[PDB]
Amino acid sequence: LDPGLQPGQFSADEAGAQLFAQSYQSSAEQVLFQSVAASWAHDTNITAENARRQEEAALLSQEFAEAWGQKAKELYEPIWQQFTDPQLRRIIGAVRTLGSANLPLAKRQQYNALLSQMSRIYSTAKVCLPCWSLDPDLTNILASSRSYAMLLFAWEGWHNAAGIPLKPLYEDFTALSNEAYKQDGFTDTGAYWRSWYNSPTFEDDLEHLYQQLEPLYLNLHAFVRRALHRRYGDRYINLRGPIPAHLLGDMWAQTWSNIYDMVVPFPDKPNLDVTSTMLQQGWQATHMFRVAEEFFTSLELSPMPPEFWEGSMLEKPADGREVVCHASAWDFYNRKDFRIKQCTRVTMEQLVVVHHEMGHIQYFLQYKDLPVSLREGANPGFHEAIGDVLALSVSTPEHLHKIGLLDRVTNDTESDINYLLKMALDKIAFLPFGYLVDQWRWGVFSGRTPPSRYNFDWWYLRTKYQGICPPVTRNETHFDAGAKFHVPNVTPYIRYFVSFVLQFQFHEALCKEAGYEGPLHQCDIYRSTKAGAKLRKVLRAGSSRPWQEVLKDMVGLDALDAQPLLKYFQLVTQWLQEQNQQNGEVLGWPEYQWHPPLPDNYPEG
Ligand SMILES: *[C@@H]1O[C@H](CO[C@@H]2O[C@@H](C)[C@@H](O)[C@@H](O)[C@@H]2O)[C@@H](O[C@@H]2O[C@H](CO)[C@@H](O[C@@H]3O[C@H](CO)[C@@H](O)[C@H](O)[C@@H]3O)[C@H](O)[C@H]2NC(C)=O)[C@H](O)[C@H]1NC(C)=O
Ligand SMILES: C[C@H](CP(=O)(O)[C@H](Cc1ccccc1)NC(=O)[C@H](N)Cc1nnn[nH]1)C(=O)N[C@@H](C)C(N)=O
Ligand SMILES: *[C@@H]1O[C@H](CO[C@@H]2O[C@@H](C)[C@@H](O)[C@@H](O)[C@@H]2O)[C@@H](O)[C@H](O)[C@H]1NC(C)=O
Ligand SMILES: *[C@@H]1O[C@H](CO)[C@@H](O)[C@H](O)[C@H]1NC(C)=O
Ligand SMILES: [Cl-]
Ligand SMILES: [Zn+2]
């Protein structure tokens, strides 16, 4: 460690801790900057050399964390929890947790190489015709093909290509990760990940939310299954069984927006799939990001700085460059450089993703003057919810009209059902998936799911919660959890489930603050500077305060609450229930063992 980055000496008490923290933050930004930079260089240009540079940057970060980590424990270990300054306790508790820096050097090098290689496998995997990338090739197949056999080829090829080679590495990663966090006092890495919500009842609280939400999912599921049965027939769809996992428009069946075509209840009302209008009008990536930005500035939030426009990667490079295409928002921790890296495609769903990523950026801009340790969400679900809340307003038929994407205007019950059904295909269909991913990982980290049961337990949870089944046989050679980005990229998922509940709590409060007085699902906060100020207060707090109290200041309640989501969807919740009854549907999938047959031609599309 460079001498300037090393910790000096400090008194063993709170006034020393504060000087410690200032000295730390001074050196942290440089260490953060070089590792973010090196990750950026790699993820926008996947090369062995850039992987090497990133691993060295990560080793440097580990050196930094050990030095300051061990000094913090030398002076402050048995007194930091009684400090008067609550932000200083948060800062100190963070520095004192070493994580992977608890590993000896050799194992640090093993760990960093495992992360690099798992990331490279996921982001460079291809499906070859007897070759397609995940983004855009396989994604567009999953979204637009209605050929059972073709969808099957893409789904199987992707899961086999990404997952199978990842499994031995994921096993070794899990062991080293657990060894590292066990030395910070956590029983396993999952306990560490859950501690970020600072709630002793986290898992029970989540289960209680899901119980309130599940009936909405079960009714959407049965309604969509019926539509699928009309198109693919009784041989490929079982009306009392799980839905084959490749038929819902998305590689993970986690959002069903792309089959809106087949389920739209009132096709004579305005056509809410405005993707074609975007293409007819010549929308490109940069337009999408400029339209998102202007929503933020309409609220008197900040525009994207010039460094964002000059540095960001907003389209997949066409110059023969391997990149990580999975969207991300980047804080370089120098208070100046903030970027998005998205392989943006011209679709309405991608326009919502653009807002989601820009919501991350806006957070970074508002708290860039906090101590680096407090530059994060009040919890990770907050950070994930910011852009989604704004996109809730953007998605309304009235707002789409304002921005030229929906010429025809209506305000009637059929049009509302259409719109709420389309929104539910994104927000309701996602809830079981957002909930199950880290149930799987928590069981792996705890050891209840050994490698011998990685896929058995994944599909147990996929069937239990999502009511889907794999369309070809799977065994423990397959590692289908590894075919989802966040798993090999070692980044948690429960934040998205929390965000999907939170974002409707946020939406209700912002709409009220803007003075909006109609149905919650027709609120558009565009140009509400009062709504903007209320959101800005949340953004500026970073993690300086407990998320339960930031929440109460914003929405008037100190807990996650499903009621705003339920209120938003109430009309289509009622309607789907009626429709399923009148069709004599079975809610659920009591033929839990059922899987579809293979196409007679298979393999062939
Ligand atoms: C789409 O239409 C709905 C429904 O409009 C209502 O029903 C129609 C059949 C007509 O009879 C309308 O004249 C009637 O208002 C609109 O929702 C409604 O919005 C108004 C405000 O614009 C609400 O009235 C307010 O009620 C609050 C109490 O909550 C009072 O404090 C206010 O002073 C004001 O009178 C009305 O409650 C609301 N209805 C429902 C069921 O929420 C909606 O605005 C419209 N959408 C668009 C985009 O134009
Ligand atoms: C599109 C979105 C990408 P994201 O912005 O959430 C992305 C996922 C990710 C995580 C680690 C490394 C690389 C990427 N997260 C980020 O870019 C940010 N670092 C989020 C952040 N949160 N606090 N500071 N930053 C996403 O993954 N959504 C879920 C629902 C999904 N598509 O499965
Ligand atoms: C696991 O599966 C491997 C892949 O074979 C393909 O998938 C299996 C599940 C069957 O559907 C088979 O018809 C496919 O060819 C097999 O090579 C392997 O032997 C299977 N068993 C084990 C223990 O790995
Ligand atoms: C990609 O990385 C290589 C080093 O691995 C570098 O020489 C090259 O300039 C990079 N390409 C771009 C477009 O940055
Ligand atoms: Cl999380
Ligand atoms: Zn995000």
* Distance, CA of 439 to CA of 139 (rounded, Å): 26
- For 396, what's the count of Cα atoms within 13 Å in the CB-facing half-sphere? 20
What tokens does 226 get? 């019926």
Give the ligand at the shortest distance from the Cα of 386. 6
Q: What is the DSSP letter of 465?
A: I
For 468, phi then psi, to 5°, come to -125, 165
Contact assessment for residue 474 and residue 458, using Cβ atoms and an 8 Å cutoff: no
Contact assessment for residue 468 and residue 244, using Cβ atoms and an 8 Å cutoff: yes
Relative to beta strand 132-133, strand 126-127 is antiparallel
The residues near 52 (Cβ < 8 Å, ≥ 6 apart) are none
Residue of 565, 540, 538 whose CA lies nearest to 549: 538
User: 48: which strand partners?
Assistant: none
* Distance, CA of 257 to CA of 243 (rounded, Å): 16
**Burial level of 78, CB count in 10 A (0-12/13-18/19+)?**
exposed
Ligand 2, atom 11, lies closest to the CA of 491
Task: Please name the helix (run of DSSP H) or strand (run of DSSP E) that holds residue 91, with its range, or none.
Answer: helix 86-95
Give the ligand at the shortest distance from the Cα of 318. 4
What secondary structure does DSSP assign to 513-530, as a single string?
HTT--S-GGG---TT-HH
Residue of 192, 177, 187, 191 whose CA lies nearest to 100: 177
What technique was this entry resolved by?
X-ray
* Distance, CA of 256 to CA of 236 (rounded, Å): 18
* Distance, CA of 557 to CA of 299 (rounded, Å): 24
| Residue whose structure tokens are 């209120």 | 567
Residue of 525, 512, 473, 61 whose CA lies nearest to 296: 525
Give the distance, in angstroms, between the CA of residue 293 and the centroid of all CA atoms in the same chain. 20
Range of the domain at 20: 1-605
What tokens does 199 get? 């709630």
Task: Please name the helix (run of DSSP H) or strand (run of DSSP E) that holds residue 69, with its range, or none.
Answer: helix 48-76
Q: Helix, strand, coil shares of the chain as percentages rounded to 5? A: 60, 5, 35
Query: Catalytic residue at 508?
Result: no
Substitution candidate for ligand 1 out of 409, 419, 516, 517 with most atoms within 8 A of CB? 517
The reply to whether ligand 3 has any atom less than 6 angstroms from the CB of 477 is yes
The total of structural domains in the chain comes to 1
Give the distance, in angstroms, between the CA of residue 148 and the centroid of all CA atoms in the same chain. 28
The residues near 353 (Cβ < 8 Å, ≥ 6 apart) are 327, 342, 344
Q: Which atom of ligand 1 is nearest to the CA of 398?
A: 48
Residue numbering of the annotated binding site for Zn(2+): 356, 360, 384
- CA 332, 335, 337, 338 dihedral sign is positive
| Residue whose structure tokens are 């994580």 | 99
* Distance, CA of 209 to CA of 397 (rounded, Å): 29
What tokens does 74 get? 């030398």
**Burial level of 198, CB count in 10 A (0-12/13-18/19+)?**
exposed
**Through-space distance between the first and last CA atoms of the chain, rounded to whole angstroms:** 56
Contact assessment for residue 356 and residue 388, using Cβ atoms and an 8 Å cutoff: yes
Long-range contacts, 267-274 (Cβ 8 Å, 24+): 268/414, 269/410, 269/412, 269/414, 269/415, 269/418, 270/397, 270/406, 270/408, 270/409, 270/410, 270/415, 270/418, 272/397, 272/400, 272/406, 272/418, 272/419, 272/422, 273/348, 274/348, 274/400, 274/405, 274/406
Long-range contacts, 277-282 (Cβ 8 Å, 24+): 277/405, 277/406, 278/346, 278/347, 278/348, 278/351, 278/405, 279/346, 281/404
Helices 563-582 & 202-232 angle (0-180, nearest 10): 30
Ligand 4, atom 9, lies closest to the CA of 45
Catalytic residue among 357, 376, 513, 585: 357
Query: Which residues does a 6 A CB cutoff place in the pocket of ligand 2?
Result: 326-329, 353, 356-357, 360, 376-377, 383-384, 489, 491, 496
How many Å is the Cα radius of gyration of the chain?
Answer: 24
Query: Catalytic residue at 300?
Result: no
**Burial level of 318, CB count in 10 A (0-12/13-18/19+)?**
exposed
* Distance, CA of 432 to CA of 252 (rounded, Å): 12
Substitution candidate for ligand 3 out of 452, 469, 473, 478 with most atoms within 8 A of CB? 473
